[PDB]
Every structure is written in structure tokens, then in C-alpha cells.
């Protein structure tokens with residue numbers, strides 16, 4: 001778990017070839033004596049910024065490149081400066097993905113795009129268009145099958161459809177992304193989303209479909225199609241299914257336009273093992289043998305390493321991946337990407353479920369994606385009472401504001417309570433959103449039993465913290 | 476995510492039928508208007524006690540019953556008092572598993588035991604004994620296969636072997652478990668472990684084998700045998716494999732003796748939805764239809780509900796589960812179970828890898844399993860400096876002690892740093908174990924850039940917290 005001199009800790013997502021990566025680690029250990037521990041914590045991409053600067057992260061973090069600009073802006077990443085000879089071993093466009101403010105911030109590993117994955121026995125002539133899928137589903141349902149299942153809970157999987165007829169994240173102009181010019185609520189985006197929503201209302205898909213439901217349904221031969229990336233191919237191979245990987249369907253005659261990720265490896269700026277990390281990545285992983293070991297576990301996609309990619313490129317599944325990639329767009333790496341994703345995630349889910357209209361959902365995503373970040377300097381937190389007797393209550397009031405002093409309407413707040421002794425009895429109300437932007441309250445009732453101090457910390461937007469204390473006394 | 480009046484949040488492990496459970500939730504929602512959100516956080520069993528009492532848990536927690544005594548001791552669980560008619564619908568021994576200090580603390584759902592799962596094409600006559608497996612592996616390796624792969628990283632999977640020839644957790648006598656009488660280092664336990672270790676050294680298994688490696692190897696037809704529970708059967712069915720589920724091999728002519736878990740559902744004492752939770756569990760889940768929906772996703776094992784179990788019991792896989800269960804032991808539910816597991820986990824891993832001898836590994840597990848818990852009242856935490864100028868360092872010293880004032884040698888300490896502004900530059904050393912029991916130090920160097928206050932909290936044994944603060948000032 002712990003970062004220490006002389007050992008390497010690596011975090012990679014649980015859908016990737018972590019076992020194969022650990023094999024590369026074993027080889028490094030054999031040669032160097034340096035143990036390499038590969039972990040796949042949930043929410044690693046959220047945890048990393050919280051722990052990296054405060055002494056508790058991995059030495060190396062793997063994620064798609066979209067997360068890395070935010071990390072770099074915060075100073076969390078070592079600058080990557082490989083020799084020209086090494087740089088020349090990887091595709092130039094992959095280095096571009098991991099460049100932030102003129103500096104290389106990670107090593108590129110592999111290029112990922114979603115494709116249409118289809119069952120050749122059920123559906124050897126997969127549809128050209130999205131909009132026929134409902135009629136197709138009707139046909140399949142009459143023989144115990146469904147047309148299509150994919151993960152509706154992650155916006156990555158729905159974006160290609162939202163983008164097909166013109167939806168965009170941030171407008172690109174004059175050498176940069178305009179962080180206030182968000183394209184999620186344009187005509188093209190509302191449509192794509194509407195379409196999905198109609199698929200649902202018409203009982204072709206289920207709003208609750210997640211990664212595991214879709215994977216199981218495809219791999220068991222129950223659904224004719226899924227939308228997934230190269231990492232998914234291994235489990236399909238394990239199954240009995242004869243599958244193809246192809247171009248995503250069109251929408252309004254336009255290609256679906258997936259957001260393309262470059263799986264990337266960053267080095268923690270606070271690591272005492274930066275040089276070892278670089279050696280591991282450059283000399284062990286980013287080799288034919290190293291990438292093969294990871295790929296054999298879960299396929300990587302179109303790898304960044306030219307020598308190995310030249311071999312993979314022959315695979316029709318890879319050719320299809322690259323085709324879909326070329327029809328989409330390489331994700332920005334800017335800090336605002338997470339805000340964009342969080343916003344779109346909420347809009348797809350809310351709409352799919354009919355908890356809001358498409359017009360409304362997407363209008364709101366636009367606001368939230370473009371929102372300023374909370375400022376520690378202007379955010380307020382107080383409690384009305386710092387000592388409680390049994391039966392007394394204290395209320396926390398917090399008001400979250402940006403750098404300009406303007407409220408931030410939607411904010412992630414993580415509450416943590418530190419307890420002196422675990423002997424006192426306490427009741428916590430919900431964190432209540434009040435009827436003005438940025439304002440939340442929480443009621444805490446001391447019920448006695450034992451004297452106990454508690455310290456309540458609110459972490460805002462997975463960044464800064466404010467804290468209050470309560471002394472519970474029996475008298 | 477959040478606990479709120481009028482909605483249900485459920486936590487269940489990611490290896491269980493969470494999608495099927497969500498289906499039961501949908502039915503409840505249809506009837507009642509109460510949304511049911513099923514989550515599968517990693518480490519849910521560790522998180523639950525940390526958040527349940529402090530206003531941030533689920534309404535309902537699912538885990539095997541072994542975890543629940545600790546939760547109950549801490550006051551985290553609502554007492555369960557179903558009508559006699561309802562009680563009579565479930566097997567008596569399952570209620571016994573969820574009784575703590577004379578009170579029912581959860582609803583029993585299903586009985587789980589590990590079995591030997593084997594590939595009928597590769598190995599239709601699976602071995603009787605463990606000790607022949609190495610020779611068998613030799614035969615299989617000569618035809619591109621291995622004999623056996625199972626999760627070595629979780630002690631649950633190795634326990635049946637450790638226990639076969641007499642290993643035990645806590646001695647049971649006079650109506651109770653003796654928490655100071657730990658059986659992990661007896662002759663029978665050292666042997667079983669030694670055997671596994673020899674399997675490894677002789678290249679029959681790999682010390683690094685985890686759940687996913689083993690699952691993939693079995694399901695792809697690469698390994699003849701695995702050790703797993705009923706939840707695993709779904710993915711095997713998806714694969715091409717013809718498999719059987721049978722009695723675990725013997726060791727020294729003794730049955731392997733798995734620790735048997737009762738998957739159980741507890742209600743958070745702090746839930747404002749206790750009655751809804753009870754209705755969901757009693758009236759929706761613990762019905763033929765409800766359990767079927769979960770079972771169809773991932774098999775539950777031998778369910779607690781007699782009416783449904785009578786149907787399942789016909790399944791030879793269930794018969795085998797029950798056979799292995801009867802050869803093992805129902806886990807204690809006492810608070811000390813987690814300490815036991817943590818200890819055995821470290822001993823298996825350390826030994827399997829050859830980082831310690833079996834004799835040593837198991838001697839140490841014994842000490843740690845029997846150890847007193849840290850006391851908030853006697854644990855020390857201080858920092859030598861509470862204000863720093865740039866280039867100055869402060870050192871935290873903590874000394875962890877039990878209720879009696881005795882040091883606790885091994886302690887889990889989770890460090891969290893709350894940051895005022897994220898503008899200061901700080902360097903954190905490792906948390907250093909000093910050369911006497913219970914004592915740890917950490918060096919923090921302020922590097923300037925900006926004035927910033929940080930608050931550093933140490934949480935001990937996932938229980939109490941102590942905190943210090945540092946004001947970093949440029950002057």
C-alpha cells in the first residue's frame with residue numbers, strides 16, 4: 001500500500017491488465033531487487049489528487065490522459081523528459097495527448113476508442129444506423145434476445161451518440177479550449193440524447209443497464225451488440241461467443257464520435273522513487289515484451305510503441321478501434337474535463353430515467369460543466385455551538401463560493417467525522433441543500449452517554465477542507 | 476450515495492448478485508415509491524463502521540456474518556425482532572449465525588462454503604487428496620495445463636487447508652470463544668501452510684495468484700481446478716467449460732474444513748428508514764421471487780429461506796456446497812474475527828512468498844490475532860512544532876497502547892491531511908515504525924511558496940482519531 005524509498009507502488013484501473021502489468025513488475029524486481037506492487041483501487045483517479053501531495057499515493061498512476069491536466073495544474077506530476085531516441089519510439093500524437101502547458105506530464109501507453117461489438121451468430125450484418133436499432137430489437141425480442149446493451153451509467157459510453165450530430169465538450173479556438181464555451185446542449189447533443197431516451201421509453205434498453213449487466217448479457221449470447229473498448233475482448237474470448245468489432249452506427253448519417261483516450265502513466269512528483277519509476281516505464285513496460293505481457297491479460301488497444309503497434313495493426317479489431325478513433329476526437333487534458341464528465345454523467349442518468357427532460361438535463365450540464373471551482377479563500381463554514389450538553393443540537397452552515405465570491409451551485413462535499421473515543425452518542429441529520437446556491441446545513445444532536453469531542457471536516461470538490469469541533473459534555 | 480429519509484441505500488460486495496438485488500429494489504420502488512440504490516464499494520465492510528455512526532453509511536449492509544459482532548458491539552446495528560411466523564421461514568442455524576449477545580443483529584440470506592471446482596474434460600476424476608496435486612500438476616503441465624489455481628491473497632481460500640489437520644481460530648469452551656486461545660500456530664496449521672508453501676517452491680502454484688488470475692485460468696480451460704464459492708458459478712457458465720463442484724481434497728486423510736459464512740443483511744442503527752429496510756428485507760428479498768432474482772444473477776449458495784432452499788437442494792452443486800459446509804465450521808461472529816483474518820492474511824502471503832518461514836509466520840499471526848485493541852484513552856500523538864517557517868521540519872510521534880497501557884505492536888494507521896488552500900509546498904516523509912512496539916514517527920517539511928495551515932489526522936485501527944495542526948508561514 002505505502003510509498004517508500006526502494007519500492008514501487010502502481011495504481012491502474014481494474015478493467016485493465018493489472019495482472020500482466022504485475023508480471024512486468026516481477027521482471028523488474030528480479031533484475032533490481034525493487035518490489036513492484038500493482039493495485040487497482042476503486043476511484044483511483046479521484047483518490048490520487050487527494051493523497052499524492054499529502055504523502056500517500058502511488059509512485060505511478062495509470063489513467064486515460066484526460067485526467068492529467070488537472071493533476072499537472074496542481075503540481076502533482078513529475079515532468080517527463082525522455083531522450084529523443086526514446087521519444088521517437090512512440091507515435092507523436094500520443095505525446096501530444098500527454099503535453100500540458102508545454103511540458104510532457106506522463107508516458108503514453110495505448111490508444112483507446114469504443115467500438116461496436118457484435119455477435120456474428122445472432123447478427124452477422126450489424127446495423128449501419130442507430131435509429132433502426134429499435135425495430136431490430138423488436139425482431140430479436142421475438143426470439144429471446146435483445147439488440148443492444150451497454151453501460152449507461154458512465155457518460156464515456158453515451159458520448160459517441162451525443163457527439164454524432166454535433167455535441168461537443170469545450171470549443172477549441174486560438175490554440176486553446178474555451179472553458180466557458182460548452183457544447184453539450186446544442187441541437188446535435190439534445191437529439192443524440194433524445195434518441196437514447198426514446199430507445200429506453202420504448203423498452204429497447206433499460207435505464208439501469210451498467211457495465212456488468214451489459215458484459216454478462218453479451219458474453220452469455222443474450223444481446224446481439226455491445227459498445228466497449230479493447231480491454232473487454234479477453235472476457236469475450238473466454239465466453240462461447242463469435243464476435244466482431246466494427247464501426248459504431250451512424251446517427252443522422254453522421255459517424256458516432258467517441259472521445260478517444262490515451263492510457264497514460266504519470267509519476268508522482270512527491271515520489272522518492274522517480275528515477276526507478278522512469279526506468280520501469282521506459283526500460284521494462286514500454287518494450288515489445290512489456291506491452292505484450294499487459295496485452296495478453298487485457299488488450300490495450302492501439303499501443304503507443306510503434307514497434308509493437310506495427311504487429312497489432314494487422315488485427316481487424318485494432319483496425320476497427322483505429323477507425324472509430326479517427327471518427328472521434330482525442331480528449332482534452334484540461335483540468336475542466338472532470339467537471340465536464342460529472343455533468344454529462346448526471347444529465348444522461350437523469351434523462352434516461354425520466355427524472356428530467358433532455359432539454360433540461362443538457363441545459364443544466366452546460367451550466368455545471370462551465371462552473372468555476374470552489375475557492376478555499378471565499379468559502380464559509382461555521383457551527384453555531386462548539387460545546388453541547390445532552391439533548392442539545394448544533395448546526396453547521398457552509399456557503400461555497402468561487403474565487404470571485406460567487407456561489408457555486410453544485411458542489412461535492414465529503415463529510416468526515418473524527419472521533420475522540422467512540423463512546424458518545426450522536427445523531428446526524430442529512431447534509432441539507434438550502435434554497436439558495438452554494439448553501440448547505442447539517443444538524444448534529446449530542447445524546448450523551450459519555451463525554452466526547454468530535455471534529456467534523458468538510459472537503460470541497462475533492463480539494464480544500466474546512467473543519468469545526470464539538471465538545472460533547474454530560475453536565 | 477447519501478442516506479436520507481424516504482430512500483434506501485444498500486451496500487453489497489461486488490462478487491455477489493448486486494444487479495439481481497437491484498431488480499428486487501425496482502419492485503419495491505414500484506409498489507412504494509421508495510427508490511432503492513444498490514452499491515458495491517470496495518472495502519465496504521471496513522468503510523461501514525467508519526461511516527455508519529457518523530451519518531454516512533447505507534441503510535442496509537450485506538456481508539458474511541463474521542463481521543457483524545464487531546458492528547453490534549459498537550452499536551451500529553438495529554436489533555432485528557421479526558415475528559415468529561417469519562423466523563420460522565428460515566433455518567434455525569442461520570439465525571444462530573446472526574445472534575450476538577442474545578440479540579438478532581441481521582437477517583440471514585444464504586449459506587456459503589468453498590468447494591473444489593473442476594474441469595470435467597481435463598480432469599473428470601478430481602483428486603482425493605491435496606498432496607498428490609503436485610504430481611498431477613506435473614502431468615498437466617506436460618500438456619499445457621496446470622492442476623490448480625485459487626486466490627492466495629485472501630485467507631478465506633487457504634483456511635480450509637490450514638484447518639484440515641487441526642488449525643483453529645479461537646478455542647470454543649464454556650459457551651464462548653476464548654479470544655486469547657488462538658489455534659493458527661498449532662502442528663496441524665503449520666503443516667497445512669507448509670504444504671501450500673511447498674506447492675509454490677515446487678512451481679505448482681504461484682505465490683502471486685489472486686482471484687482474477689485464478690478465475691481467468693479456470694474459465695479459459697487452462698487450469699483443471701479452482702477453489703471458489705457459489706457466486707463464481709455464473710461466470711463459469713458463461714465460459715465454454717464443463718465443470719463439476721465437489722468435496723475439497725483431504726489433507727493427512729482429514730477433510731478440508733472451510734470457514735462457513737452466512738451472507739447477512741444488517742440495518743444501520745442510525746438509518747431514518749429502519750422500518751422501510753425491514754419491509755424490503757422481509758417482504759421483498761426474503762421471498763422465493765426475491766432470492767430467485769439475486770440467485771439468477773450470481774448464485775447465493777444454500778439459501779436461508781426453507782421454501783426456496785428445498786428447490787435449490789436438488790442441484791448437485793448445492794449438495795456439494797452443503798457437504799463442504801458440514802465438514803467445516805460456521806465462522807464466529809465475535810469482534811475479534813477481523814483481527815484473526817488480518818493476521819492470517821499476512822502469514823499466508825509472507826510465507827507463500829518466502830518473506831518468512833511457516834513456523835515464524837504462524838507464530839506471529841497468533842500474537843496479532845490475540846492482541847488487544849488500541850485504546851483512545853492511552854494512545855499518544857504529538858508534534859514537536861505547531862508553526863513552521865520555510866525549510867523547517869516538524870515530527871509527529873505517536874505511541875499506540877491498549878486499555879491497560881500496553882503497546883500494540885502492529886497497528887493500522889490511516890493518515891489524512893486536510894489542507895487550507897493547496898498553495899503551500901510540503902514534503903512528507905514515510906510513517907516510520909520505530910524500534911519499540913507501538914511507536915511511529917513522521918517528518919513533515921514546510922517548503923514555503925504560500926502560507927497554509929494543514930491538519931493531520933491519524934485514525935487508529937479504523938476506530939478513533941487523533942489530530943495535530945501545523946501553521947506554515949513564510950516569514
Ligand SMILES: OC[C@H]1O[C@H](O[C@H]2[C@H](O)[C@@H](O)[C@@H](O[C@H]3[C@H](O)[C@@H](O)[C@@H](O[C@H]4[C@H](O)[C@@H](O)[C@@H](O)O[C@@H]4CO)O[C@@H]3CO)O[C@@H]2CO)[C@H](O)[C@@H](O)[C@@H]1O
Pocket residue numbers: 013015043044045046064065066067112153154155156157229261338341342345
Ligand atoms: O460520482 C460519479 C463517479 O465519479 C467518478 O467517475 C468520474 C471520473 O472521476 C472522471 O474522471 C470521469 O471519468 C471519465 C474518464 O476520466 C475518461 O477517461 C473515460 O473513462 C473511460 C476510460 O478512458 C476507459 O479506459 C475505460 O476505463 O472506461 C472508462 C469509462 O468508465 O470516461 C469517464 C466518464 O465515463 O467521469 C467519471 C464520472 O462519469 C468515480 O470513479 C465513480 O465511481 C463515480 O460514480
Ligand SMILES: OC[C@H]1O[C@H](O[C@H]2[C@H](O)[C@@H](O)[C@@H](O[C@H]3[C@H](O)[C@@H](O)[C@@H](O[C@H]4[C@H](O)[C@@H](O)[C@@H](O)O[C@@H]4CO)O[C@@H]3CO)O[C@@H]2CO)[C@H](O)[C@@H](O)[C@@H]1O
Pocket residue numbers: 488490518519520521539540541542587628629630631632704736813816817820
Ligand atoms: O488490508 C487487507 C485487506 O483488508 C480488507 O479485507 C479483510 C476484511 O475486512 C475482513 O473482514 C476479513 O475478510 C474475511 C471476511 O470477513 C469473510 O467473510 C471471508 O470473506 C469471503 C466471503 O465470506 C465470501 O462471500 C466471498 O466474498 O469471499 C470472501 C473472501 O475474499 O473471508 C475474508 C478473509 O479472506 O479479512 C480481510 C483480509 O483478508 C479489505 O477488504 C481488503 O481490500 C484488504 O486488502
